[PDB]
């Protein structure tokens, strides 16, 4: 579920930058938020 | 507030790590309905408490919560009257034993540190209940100066610049905290005035020179004396005129 939530948060970071394609930075920023912050 | 077994009847831990019996002893301090206030100044310490004489039949000379533990140390008792005398008698015995065993007067800090040690046993052994009384010793140390120490049923003890015990302890604590924030090394007159004012403002009584007892210790005379009604009236008159 945490791994699945990381993907969902990764797409959120693409939306925050108004991008269409999810980049590797988005997955890394999603990993930091889901695991470390939460 | 979970319970499991006899955690509310004997001094044993609750599932969340609480001693309800010790906590209930704190609510026992408020059963007397009296509030005591102790304030420490630059060269003096003052204990002030209200004395209630419901009927003229009672000898007002006997209804005193101020006790002379030794010549240089005095205390004010709040809580059960019967438990208060036992602590005072116990404190007097330990003070006398300290004088005999060590050759010098017992320090104020060590007096309750012993008393808090006796009251801690009550919170650990289950065959007896904690003493539902609060002890506030005031005395003049040789080097540290004026000292005030509250001595609770739980065996806790700490020094205080200005403390209070009783029903209005937290109302009086907020008042004394405000005065201490001003950072004034009060003289003997000011300490009595702020102690009387703290009890007066919180209770809203406008004390008469028969409704409170004042016990002071000063560096000039490191002995514990009870203020007479004539002496107590002078401070009340000074309070009214300002």
């Amino acid at each position: 579920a945490e791994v699945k939530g990381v993907c969902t948060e990764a797409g959120m970071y693409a939306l925050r930058e108004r991008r269409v394609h999810v980049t590797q930075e988005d997955f890394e920023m999603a990993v930091a938020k889901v695991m470390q912050k939460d | 507030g979970s319970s499991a077994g006899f955690d509310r009847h004997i001094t044993i831990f609750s599932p969340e790590g609480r001693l309800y019996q010790v906590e209930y002893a704190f609510k026992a301090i408020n059963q007397g309905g009296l509030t005591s206030v102790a304030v420490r100044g630059k060269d003096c310490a003052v204990i002030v408490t209200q004395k209630k004489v419901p009927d003229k039949l009672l000898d007002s000379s006997t209804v005193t919560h101020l006790f002379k533990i030794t010549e240089n140390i005095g205390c004010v008792m709040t809580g059960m009257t019967a438990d208060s005398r036992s602590q005072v008698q116990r404190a007097r015995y330990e003070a006398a034993n300290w004088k005999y065993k060590y050759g010098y007067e017992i320090p104020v800090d060590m007096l309750c540190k012993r008393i808090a040690d006796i009251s801690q046993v009550y919170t650990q052994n289950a065959e007896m209940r904690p003493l539902g009384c609060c002890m506030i010793l005031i005395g003049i140390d040789e080097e540290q100066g004026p000292q005030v120490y509250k001595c609770d049923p739980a065996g806790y003890y700490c020094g205080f610049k200005a403390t209070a015990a009783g029903v209005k302890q937290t109302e009086s604590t907020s008042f004394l905290e405000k005065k201490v924030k001003k950072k004034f090394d009060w003289t003997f007159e000011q300490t009595v005035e702020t102690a009387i004012t703290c009890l007066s403002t919180v209770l809203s009584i406008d004390f008469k020179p028969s409704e409170i007892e004042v016990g002071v210790v000063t560096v000039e005379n490191p002995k514990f004396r009870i203020l007479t009604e004539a002496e107590i009236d002078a401070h009340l008159v000074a309070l009214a005129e300002r």
């Binding site: 930075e25 890394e28 920023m29 990993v31 930091a32 938020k33 695991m35 470390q36 912050k37 | -």
Partner: protein, 208 residues
């Protein structure tokens, strides 16, 4: 004795700042006996005040030369006080934007002092400050070398807040070298490290 001139220096604060300097700076030159628990406390208070005054006057010789002169004195006071003295004196010089040219030199001297005193936490912040000083002195190549070493040490101890700052300095340094692909990677490292911890508003602002 020495305390009286401290009040006189404090009284001279309302007067000219340079006028008060002669009082504090004389105390700084004043030699001390074995312990003098009062005198060293005054000199420590005077030197912290003397450097604080020079943060407004802006005199490099008396400020930068102070740190090179008080190194023997740092061996007398307690290590906690000495590290604070080194930090405070160095911080005032570098917060003074005047590039006197020796800012790199004494910062490296303090790093050597930190290594000698085995104060890793003090050293690491000094090295991080040095990387910023290297960037401001167009010394991009040495900034990356020191930043690369600090990145590994910061990573092991999970000091994410300091990791972001040094990573951002790497991102700025690579950008000045006209290397966008490496600047983005360093900024990516700073952003992901920032997302894992709470960023103070200053740290979030420089990241953004």
């Amino acid at each position: 004795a020495a305390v009286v001139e401290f009040q006189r220096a404090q009284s001279l604060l309302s007067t000219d700042r340079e006028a008060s300097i002669d009082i504090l700076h004389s105390i700084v030159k004043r030699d001390i006996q074995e312990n003098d628990e009062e005198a060293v406390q005054v000199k420590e208070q005077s030197i912290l005040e003397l450097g604080s005054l020079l943060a407004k006057t802006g005199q490099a010789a008396e400020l930068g030369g102070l740190l090179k002169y008080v190194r023997p004195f740092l061996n007398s006071i307690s290590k906690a006080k000495a590290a604070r003295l080194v930090r405070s004196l160095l911080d005032l010089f570098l917060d003074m934007e005047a590039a006197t040219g020796q800012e790199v030199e004494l910062c490296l001297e303090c790093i050597e002092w930190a290594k000698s005193e085995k104060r890793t936490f003090l050293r690491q912040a000094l090295e991080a400050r040095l990387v910023s000083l290297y960037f401001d002195t167009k010394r991009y190549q040495e900034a990356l070398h020191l930043g690369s070493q600090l990145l590994r040490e910061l990573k092991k101890m999970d000091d994410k807040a300091l990791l972001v700052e040094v990573q951002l300095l790497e991102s700025k340094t690579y950008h000045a070298l006209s290397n966008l692909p490496k600047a983005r990677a360093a900024l990516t490292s700073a952003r992901t490290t920032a997302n894992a911890i709470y960023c103070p508003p200053k740290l979030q602002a420089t990241l953004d």
